[PDB]
Amino acid sequence: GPRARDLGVPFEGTPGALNAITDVAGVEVGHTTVISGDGAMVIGKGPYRTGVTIIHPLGKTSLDGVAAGRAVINGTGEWTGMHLVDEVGQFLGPIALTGTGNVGLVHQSMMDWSVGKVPEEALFSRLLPVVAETLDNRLNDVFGHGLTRDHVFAALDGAKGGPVAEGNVGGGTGMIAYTFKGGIGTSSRVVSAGDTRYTVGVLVQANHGDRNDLRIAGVQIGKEIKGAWPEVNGIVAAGPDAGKPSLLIVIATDAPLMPHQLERMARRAALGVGRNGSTAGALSGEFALAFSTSHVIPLGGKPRLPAIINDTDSETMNALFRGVVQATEEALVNQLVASETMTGANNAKVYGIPHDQLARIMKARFP
Amino acid sequence: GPRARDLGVPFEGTPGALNAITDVAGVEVGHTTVISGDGAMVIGKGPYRTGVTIIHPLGKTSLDGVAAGRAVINGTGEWTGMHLVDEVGQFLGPIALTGTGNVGLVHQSMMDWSVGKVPEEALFSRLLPVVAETLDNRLNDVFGHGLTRDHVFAALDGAKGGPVAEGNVGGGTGMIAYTFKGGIGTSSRVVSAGDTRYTVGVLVQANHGDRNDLRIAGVQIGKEIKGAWPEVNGIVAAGPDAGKPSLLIVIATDAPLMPHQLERMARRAALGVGRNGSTAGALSGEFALAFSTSHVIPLGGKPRLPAIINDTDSETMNALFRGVVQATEEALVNQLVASETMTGANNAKVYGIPHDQLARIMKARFP
Amino acid sequence: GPRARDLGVPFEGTPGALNAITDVAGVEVGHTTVISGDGAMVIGKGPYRTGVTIIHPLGKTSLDGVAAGRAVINGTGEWTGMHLVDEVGQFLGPIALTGTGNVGLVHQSMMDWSVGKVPEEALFSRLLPVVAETLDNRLNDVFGHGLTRDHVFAALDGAKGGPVAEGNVGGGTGMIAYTFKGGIGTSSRVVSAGDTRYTVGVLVQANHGDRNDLRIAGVQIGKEIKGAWPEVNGIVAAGPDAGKSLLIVIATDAPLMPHQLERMARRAALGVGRNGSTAGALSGEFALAFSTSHVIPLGGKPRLPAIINDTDSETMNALFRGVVQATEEALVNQLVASETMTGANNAKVYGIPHDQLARIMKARFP
Amino acid sequence: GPRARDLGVPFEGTPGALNAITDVAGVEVGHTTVISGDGAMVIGKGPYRTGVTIIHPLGKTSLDGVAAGRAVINGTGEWTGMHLVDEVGQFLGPIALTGTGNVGLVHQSMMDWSVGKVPEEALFSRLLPVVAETLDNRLNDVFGHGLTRDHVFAALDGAKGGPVAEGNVGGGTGMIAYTFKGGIGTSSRVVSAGDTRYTVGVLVQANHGDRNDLRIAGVQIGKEIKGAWPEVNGIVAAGPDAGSLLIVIATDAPLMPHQLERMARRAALGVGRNGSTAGALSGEFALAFSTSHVIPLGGKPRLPAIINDTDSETMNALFRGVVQATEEALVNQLVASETMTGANNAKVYGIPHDQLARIMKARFP
């Protein structure tokens, strides 16, 4: 289907070939999407609209660490492995993005997955898995154990490079963003740092923001779109006619950055988010994690840093920073466009942002 | 002169009466502006385009502390008294915003100022003054001692409530923002938290960003404006026709917030900055400090907290957060509009964003 | 069993009645201790030497939050709920301390425990459980699913005030500290803060440090102790004859704000420092402090019965000294409470010898 | 005179040749010590008991940056240049340690010092000087402008390697630690990291702690010492008869910035060994830097070797070095600082050498 650019939304900068986080060499992505049941929710019996998204920084067979740094916009949420990142500037294993109710199950499943796949002596390196959440409470039976260990194994083992599925998939399945359907979005930038061009890739799991704040390409678009407010049982449940008939950001780069430099990359995510108008609600867990696929730490070995960058080198750093801002901005709009209307638990209905209206608005604003 | 709204720039939200940080009860602002000399720079002899801006959270006569919390967007800069704020959640004395070369002089001057005004028993409370900088290196003889202790005393003693002077004044005098003239800007929002309305006021000293990134009301306006690039000696010095013929954000609120809650307010500034397009350059020291004028700590006494707010109360917190984002966004545009064209050290000429073109663009975009 | 003071170890300050975290009124502690199997390890079959320790800040029936703040000494470990604490200065629900392999199971079990006990409208408040770990890898089948949901429920439901069991129990069951047996330890201080008194309670799950660095009451005691090095099947496995993480929970009834509780938590490092360890590269050493008087009713107005000035040295120094001293003592109490244990792969770790310790203390403090 | 070891205080580990931060090659230290006036304080006239201590990480002629990271024990104090360090993991120029009242003067003086010495194109790199304080308020006329630009220039220009003067010198001149005389202290450790040796050097400016908490070599010694309490005009002013800390860590280990933060976070453990509990207004800070991981101005960073954070053999050796050198630097300070009378005739005693030596002899036969 069309992505944001295909509907005429302009963005600044040059995307990588896939315009996705997988433009960064090494990165694989996998989703398991769990959609079952309709109507009234009973805890433990669905409906389920949930899942898990896996990102392997160096592919699924890697036992090595990647240099990493994080940032917090608003920390009302969970992201495990982050004390490790703060302390030693790297993490081992995959990143899992999922629904809040699944964190514990995913965390233990990743440990289980390592058994028989990792040398015994190396197993202890698999004991701080990285698992993050947003809450799919409006569309999904959160507490009801809809996600199984097999679902997690399937995402771990099925992850791959190449085009990344966006929208109502994996961890984003039951999410809501800007009062429209939330989900997964991704984008990349190839940025010129003098005579070297690096790739910055971003994947988001979006469950944040309000329709009234939303900007797409700078256009405050909430009031321009007619209808498409959420419903319950065929009754408008939000907006002017109500009653009538968190954000996870994962940044990959092939730039050979040190961990403190990656924290800097992570802190740029907030500027990209800011472009699109949201203001970080009190309980919106908005977090960013950045890693390098060129600065790798072989397990029990010497760190591999193929080149080294000066933080005060504006030509290099600004190109990277702008890449993060732009790819984050675009990943967020790509999510909205990829996400289709869904009806879930308790008959809650949330519309995907209307393509026809969006394209019409973009054409009028950008003749 | 006209402020941003007067030129047809739309913003969301409701400003306070003055649309300035002084809409928050207790707050006084003072500037001393130093403009002397023209032509080639000789270190120690100008030209000078610098100054200092003072913000008294509770007025110039207060010996008490205000609850406070900070945030960093990019920390390549100086802001003293911040270890204190991080540790004990309050600061004593005024906030000074100035040029980088002035920090030491301002810091000692603020100590000198307390002598004779503050009981010898309370003097030690005046020994961690709050002084922050952006670099006026393109228009000002930074190292040349253009700022005097008397200049600092004048700003401390002359500060007042009511309308706040914007543009090329005080600490902002010699600054450059988005490749246009930088300086001081301010805005406020009155925000509804249930049956209680709070005030959020913001003042910025802006020296950040690139013209190519600039958004005003979502409009990427750099390429829409014709000319007005900086010059040297009548020769265009930047942009397409080149060669041819940091950010300090101060947030005040009357909301009775605890220090950790004010950190949250400070972290919202990045989103407001994000709206206007900048991407935080490698050497751009972009910082935010938030304080409450209702949560006051009498010197050596019991903290006064007139009411208490739950962090998980979205109705109250989201109103405050949106206030910070909107006031920050507008304060940044207000700065640009207030700042006039200036020629400074080494005949560097930086244009104020052209009012006529800006108004024309806003009219075409927002009929 | 004797605790540290009973063996003649001197400490500074005044302990509470129970000399435990439960000296802070309303705090409840529960353990489930899992000890089964012997001999060679088979992943998935044990031997198991693990468990879980639960701390209910306001008791097991509370749905309210407590003001909270944390500190990191060395962050190579997991402690969930901590982004929440950093952001909004409070956490809901119990603290669980456990073995690394159990984190996910405990996390989901805590959610399950809320279902049926918590009004449906309030359930979302139970979605960021606080769970922390140290690694019982030398005595326990870490990956082998030895801990069950029922074990977690039992600790949650069985938690109580009063005296706290120490040593090889709950989360500390399979741990190793200063090359001796690790485990759970607790201590408290009653402090004079201006013209009121407050209690500072500390509980530790200790799995950190090296014998050669250990100080007890300032005495570098590792070299003064004879034998008691770990073994594997009869063969001494460390020390001169070889081949022949730390979780700190601080409770107080002082009405502190979140940022002030961060300051409390940052004092733990000083008390840790007193006892000699130097925080190894992979030693996850963490502290979390909460107030039981500054409470946040769910969806309501925070309750702060009095307010303290950070610059009030009389009040704050007393509280800080309390943390340092209670931490120092909790660490030694752990060592003394922990008995010799043989576990997975016939690994054997000795409890610090009571007779030698008492002897050394007697000679050092006649 | 004697240092702590000379009075029979035992410590763990192996000190460098100088037992000082200057065991890290290329580091230079300079003090300017300002002692003048006696009797009653009149603000602006003294008595003065203050000064400044300069540490040049790569020597005074370096225009380059050093990789760096910091830690806070209790942040009630000032240390400039630290936002820079947190953000970009390096700092340019010298570290200055001084009295609280002097921070602004020192900060501007460091800028002035660069003019004429640094190419104009490079001057902007000199605009975030690193200046830290503790408060000499009981012995010194803090607000009275006792420190001059010339004093600062002298410490900057006079700094050198080799032995480092301790006690009542430079920034530590008017300080008070554990209710005894405070000041400057330094120590070092040479550590074995697998098949390589590194040096960890520590210098402190100590103005912290209470006598009742003090431990030296594990001995709670405040109560074993008789008298030596502070006085004001012949009248005991503390104790039964009453009728902040800056830690600089240098290493030649090629550590990245986040790794140096870990080093800095070890300082608290060494502080903890000596008993203090970090008072509410005690600004206790640590800064660590590498002299081998250097960043040529406007150039490519130079990292001669790289270390894995999970390499316990290498990291643990370094961490223990910080802890031990911090512990010893604190005791070296006390022993180096002599009894001093200052503003308002306040008198603060150096920890008594005779009593300390006897206590150590009794505890460690």
Ligand SMILES: CC1(C)S[C@@H]([C@@H](C=O)NC(=O)[C@H](N)c2ccccc2)N[C@H]1C(=O)O
């Ligand atoms: C159907 C709904 C999604 S619309 C909603 C309505 C009624 O209270 N409130 C909102 O608009 C609310 N601000 C909101 C809407 C979307 C995402 C987050 C918050 N009721 C919901 C639902 O029942 O889950």
Ligand SMILES: CC1(C)S[C@@H]([C@@H](C=O)NC(=O)[C@H](N)c2ccccc2)N[C@H]1C(=O)O
């Ligand atoms: C006159 C000038 C301001 S324009 C500039 C031109 C030539 O190199 N470069 C820039 O555009 C540069 N990106 C820039 C411009 C403004 C603010 C920050 C960076 N030369 C300057 C000057 O000499 O001070």
Ligand SMILES: CC1(C)S[C@@H]2[C@H](NC(=O)[C@H](N)c3ccccc3)C(=O)N2[C@H]1C(=O)O
């Ligand atoms: C219902 C909400 C108040 S919480 C939810 C979401 N926040 C998260 O997902 C976050 N990680 C989180 C916070 C608290 C507990 C568990 C998880 C957000 O914001 N949503 C609100 C909404 O739908 O309006």
Ligand SMILES: CC1(C)S[C@@H]2[C@H](NC(=O)[C@H](N)c3ccccc3)C(=O)N2[C@H]1C(=O)O
């Ligand atoms: C010339 C610059 C590289 S530094 C300057 C400004 N940055 C600051 O003001 C900041 N607080 C700072 C950083 C370093 C030393 C002293 C102060 C920024 O960015 N400017 C660049 C520009 O004009 O292009």
Ligand SMILES: CC1(C)S[C@@H]2[C@H](NC(=O)[C@H](N)c3ccccc3)C(=O)N2[C@H]1C(=O)O
């Ligand atoms: C085997 C070790 C290298 S890891 C262990 C312990 N550290 C922890 O428990 C910590 N939370 C952790 C770190 C990494 C993965 C999982 C858990 C520590 O230190 N131990 C060493 C030892 O026994 O020698």
Ligand SMILES: CC1(C)S[C@@H]2[C@H](NC(=O)[C@H](N)c3ccccc3)C(=O)N2[C@H]1C(=O)O
């Ligand atoms: C007089 C004190 C209350 S402040 C002082 C010292 N703390 C500092 O030096 C610190 N950097 C600082 C804190 C506040 C203002 C200025 C400087 C400390 O503790 N001293 C107390 C004491 O002597 O009793």
